[PDB]
Design a protein around this motif. Structure first.
Motif, mmCIF file in Angstrom:
data_model
loop_
_atom_site.group_PDB
_atom_site.id
_atom_site.type_symbol
_atom_site.label_atom_id
_atom_site.label_comp_id
_atom_site.label_asym_id
_atom_site.label_seq_id
_atom_site.Cartn_x
_atom_site.Cartn_y
_atom_site.Cartn_z
ATOM 1 N N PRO A 122 15.426 100.768 35.599
ATOM 2 C CA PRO A 122 14.902 100.245 34.343
ATOM 3 C C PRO A 122 15.735 99.060 33.870
ATOM 4 O O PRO A 122 16.961 99.049 34.028
ATOM 5 C CB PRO A 122 14.989 101.455 33.408
ATOM 6 N N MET A 123 15.050 98.060 33.313
ATOM 7 C CA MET A 123 15.666 96.844 32.773
ATOM 8 C C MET A 123 16.107 97.207 31.371
ATOM 9 O O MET A 123 15.358 96.957 30.416
ATOM 10 C CB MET A 123 14.627 95.725 32.688
ATOM 11 N N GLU A 151 27.439 99.514 29.739
ATOM 12 C CA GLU A 151 28.035 100.467 30.651
ATOM 13 C C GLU A 151 27.013 101.225 31.496
ATOM 14 O O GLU A 151 27.300 101.534 32.663
ATOM 15 C CB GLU A 151 28.890 101.458 29.871
ATOM 16 N N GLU A 152 25.844 101.538 30.914
ATOM 17 C CA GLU A 152 24.788 102.259 31.647
ATOM 18 C C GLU A 152 24.518 101.569 32.980
ATOM 19 O O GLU A 152 24.166 102.213 33.961
ATOM 20 C CB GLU A 152 23.471 102.326 30.846
ATOM 21 N N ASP A 153 24.684 100.250 33.001
ATOM 22 C CA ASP A 153 24.476 99.484 34.202
ATOM 23 C C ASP A 153 25.754 99.369 35.017
ATOM 24 O O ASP A 153 25.822 99.868 36.143
ATOM 25 C CB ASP A 153 23.981 98.095 33.846
ATOM 26 N N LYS A 157 24.552 103.113 36.635
ATOM 27 C CA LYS A 157 23.521 102.697 37.598
ATOM 28 C C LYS A 157 23.981 101.838 38.792
ATOM 29 O O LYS A 157 23.805 102.226 39.953
ATOM 30 C CB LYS A 157 22.388 101.996 36.838
ATOM 31 N N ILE A 158 24.564 100.675 38.520
ATOM 32 C CA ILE A 158 25.030 99.810 39.613
ATOM 33 C C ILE A 158 25.959 100.502 40.624
ATOM 34 O O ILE A 158 25.856 100.275 41.829
ATOM 35 C CB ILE A 158 25.705 98.542 39.075
ATOM 36 N N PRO A 159 26.881 101.350 40.153
ATOM 37 C CA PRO A 159 27.759 102.019 41.125
ATOM 38 C C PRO A 159 27.022 103.089 41.966
ATOM 39 O O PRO A 159 27.339 103.288 43.140
ATOM 40 C CB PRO A 159 28.854 102.626 40.241
ATOM 41 N N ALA A 219 22.449 88.832 36.736
ATOM 42 C CA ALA A 219 23.446 89.850 36.430
ATOM 43 C C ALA A 219 23.598 90.781 37.603
ATOM 44 O O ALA A 219 24.711 90.984 38.102
ATOM 45 C CB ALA A 219 23.069 90.625 35.186
ATOM 46 N N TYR A 220 22.486 91.333 38.074
ATOM 47 C CA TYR A 220 22.591 92.228 39.201
ATOM 48 C C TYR A 220 23.048 91.514 40.463
ATOM 49 O O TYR A 220 23.695 92.119 41.309
ATOM 50 C CB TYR A 220 21.271 92.939 39.434
ATOM 51 N N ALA A 221 22.718 90.234 40.597
ATOM 52 C CA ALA A 221 23.106 89.481 41.787
ATOM 53 C C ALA A 221 24.624 89.376 41.753
ATOM 54 O O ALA A 221 25.292 89.553 42.768
ATOM 55 C CB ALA A 221 22.444 88.105 41.792
ATOM 56 N N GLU A 222 25.165 89.127 40.566
ATOM 57 C CA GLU A 222 26.614 89.060 40.395
ATOM 58 C C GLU A 222 27.266 90.358 40.884
ATOM 59 O O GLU A 222 28.425 90.364 41.302
ATOM 60 C CB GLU A 222 26.956 88.833 38.930
ATOM 61 N N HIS A 223 26.506 91.449 40.833
ATOM 62 C CA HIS A 223 26.958 92.771 41.266
ATOM 63 C C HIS A 223 26.532 93.084 42.693
ATOM 64 O O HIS A 223 26.610 94.232 43.150
ATOM 65 C CB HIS A 223 26.418 93.839 40.322
#
Ligand SMILES: *[C@@H]1O[C@H](CO)[C@@H](O[C@@H]2O[C@H](CO)[C@@H](O)[C@H](O)[C@H]2NC(C)=O)[C@H](O)[C@H]1NC(C)=O
Length: 497
Positions: A122-123, A151-153, A157-159, A219-223
């Motif tokens: 989810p965005m 933080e949720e991301d 989520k991201i980790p 943002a996600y690309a940065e991750h």
């Protein structure tokens, strides 16, 4: 390698108990020789994707229902299977001890598991979040300079995603979807209720919202996470309802059409994420074929749409032919993809029913229906939820394939998990649905498909109480004498060369 430790909680079947040191898993895939078939069986009595083999003869000892593979009748190619990495899910997963965590991620993404290759993200917040929030809540920031991942991301989520991909058998595709935008871009200034984007397509409200997508992908690309695709909006029809309880953003087909045409499409296309695919609708199938018509007959909009994402609530009715069928008939070159599925939505239904066989049957029956009507993928909702089907900030609890009991560093894999596995584990990306005719009226739900390597895979679901003897015929190899036990689900696989 390790079987299911069953446990009953008072419903038609058992769930499989897993913890920090144990969890039922599969051995590395083995491919039986030509002439023999593999069978994975799950039953309401307790069997869980047990592997057994048999012979494909040239003698047709059967005298009942016969399913004949028709390899030359080709249909859609499968994108994949998966579930959503919602705030609720990351929360429940990271609340188990590291070892339990990995056994859980492995159950889903590993080859010792059911090989998911799709993760919906989810965005920002939805109802399966413990708080409302967006990536840019600072009022009137049209330049989006205060855009950032909470933080949720970054923490939850991201980790978990990096980790699922790290354990993943096959490549995983990421699908993103926003529920609501910043409230200051909305006609009602509230994450929920009835309100849509302010102004009209092409304006600053609409240009900012579209940028919000790129910002997100940056943002996600940065991750180090790239997305396969994003949806135009999660359930856009929800925002047209006064009183809608949680994060939403109304759009009429017309609004969505022009929004994509004038803002979303161009913006994405002109960014570094231009290869990301865009799916329209992302709402209940009853809105089809109509929504497709409106958005797709407008070439300025349709040049940007790669597929029509659909949702469904298994407890409800929604004849497929009149919806999915018709839509394909009108736009045969625009893929149909299932982005969200649900059980235990109706007010009287217990959110979670640990070990419910009915709910499993519903999942597979729904995947079969989706597959029989051109859908190229099927995505589950929350990967895992607590025993109450939460956390859900508006108490909109539902069920999930995996239930986490944080107090016992334990997680339970429900019948749904296995019904999903019966497909997800044996229908890799690029698989192509082929024909499969029944010699007569039967109560079975079945679907055949051919792997990329040319091998066969047939899933047979028996939602009836009686056993149905049956033969599967593959004209290139022979006959499979078998039986579909009442309340069961099998997956057959076999070489053709
Ligand atoms: C995790 O689950 C496993 C499987 O139930 C538990 O291990 C079993 O424990 C019983 C009772 O102590 C033994 O009789 C079995 O031999 C064990 N089975 C296996 C294959 O290990 C284990 O205790 C659970 N982990 C925790 C921390 O409770």
């Amino acid at each position: 390698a390790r079987p299911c430790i069953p446990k009953s909680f008072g419903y038609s079947s058992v769930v499989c108990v897993c913890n920090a040191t144990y969890c039922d898993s599969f051995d590395p895939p083995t491919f039986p020789a030509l002439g023999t078939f593999s069978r994975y069986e799950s039953t309401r009595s307790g069997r869980r994707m047990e592997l057994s083999m048999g012979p494909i003869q040239a003698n047709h000892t059967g005298t009942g229902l016969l399913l004949t593979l028709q390899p030359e009748q080709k249909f859609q190619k499968v994108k994949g299977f998966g579930g959503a990495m919602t705030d609720a899910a990351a929360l429940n997963i990271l609340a188990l001890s590291p070892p339990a965590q990995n056994l859980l991620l492995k159950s889903y993404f590993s080859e010792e598991g059911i090989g998911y290759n799709i993760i919906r993200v989810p965005m920002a917040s939805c109802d399966f979040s413990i708080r409302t929030y967006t990536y840019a809540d600072t009022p009137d920031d049209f330049q989006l300079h205060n855009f950032s991942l909470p933080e949720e991301d970054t923490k939850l989520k991201i980790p978990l995603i990096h980790r699922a991909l790290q354990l993943a058998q096959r490549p995983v595709s990421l699908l993103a979807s926003p529920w609501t935008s910043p409230t200051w871009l909305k006609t009602n200034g509230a994450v929920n209720g009835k309100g849509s984007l302010k102004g009209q397509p092409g304006d600053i409200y609409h240009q900012t919202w579209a940028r919000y997508f790129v910002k997100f992908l940056d943002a996600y690309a940065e991750h180090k996470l790239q997305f396969w695709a994003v949806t135009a909006e999660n359930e856009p029809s929800a925002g047209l309802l006064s009183g809608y309880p949680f994060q939403c953003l109304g759009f009429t087909p017309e609004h969505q059409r022009d929004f994509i045409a004038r803002d979303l499409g161009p913006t994405l296309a002109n960014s570094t994420h231009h290869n990301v695919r865009l799916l329209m609708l992302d709402d209940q199938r009853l809105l089809l074929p109509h929504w497709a018509k409106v958005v797709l007959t407008d070439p300025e909009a349709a040049k940007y749409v790669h597929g029509i994402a659909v949702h469904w609530y298994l407890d409800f009715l929604a004849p497929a032919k009149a919806t999915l069928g018709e839509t394909h008939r009108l736009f045969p070159n625009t893929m149909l993809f299932a982005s969200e599925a649900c059980v235990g939505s109706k007010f009287w239904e217990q959110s979670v029913r640990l070990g419910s066989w009915d709910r499993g049957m519903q999942y597979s029956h729904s995947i079969i229906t989706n597959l029989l009507y051109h859908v190229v993928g099927w995505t589950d909702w929350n990967l895992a939820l607590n025993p109450e089907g939460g956390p859900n900030w508006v108490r909109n609890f539902v069920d999930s394939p995996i239930i986490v009991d944080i107090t016992k560093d334990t997680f339970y894999k429900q019948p749904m998990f296995y019904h999903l596995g019966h497909f997800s584990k044996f229908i890799p990306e690029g698989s192509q649905r082929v024909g499969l005719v029944a010699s007569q009226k039967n109560d079975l739900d079945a679907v055949a498909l051919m792997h990329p390597d040319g091998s066969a895979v047939v899933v047979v679901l028996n939602r009836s109480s009686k056993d149905v003897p049956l033969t599967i015929k593959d004209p290139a190899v022979g006959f499979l004498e078998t039986i579909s036990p009442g309340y069961s689900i099998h997956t057959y696989l076999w070489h053709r060369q």
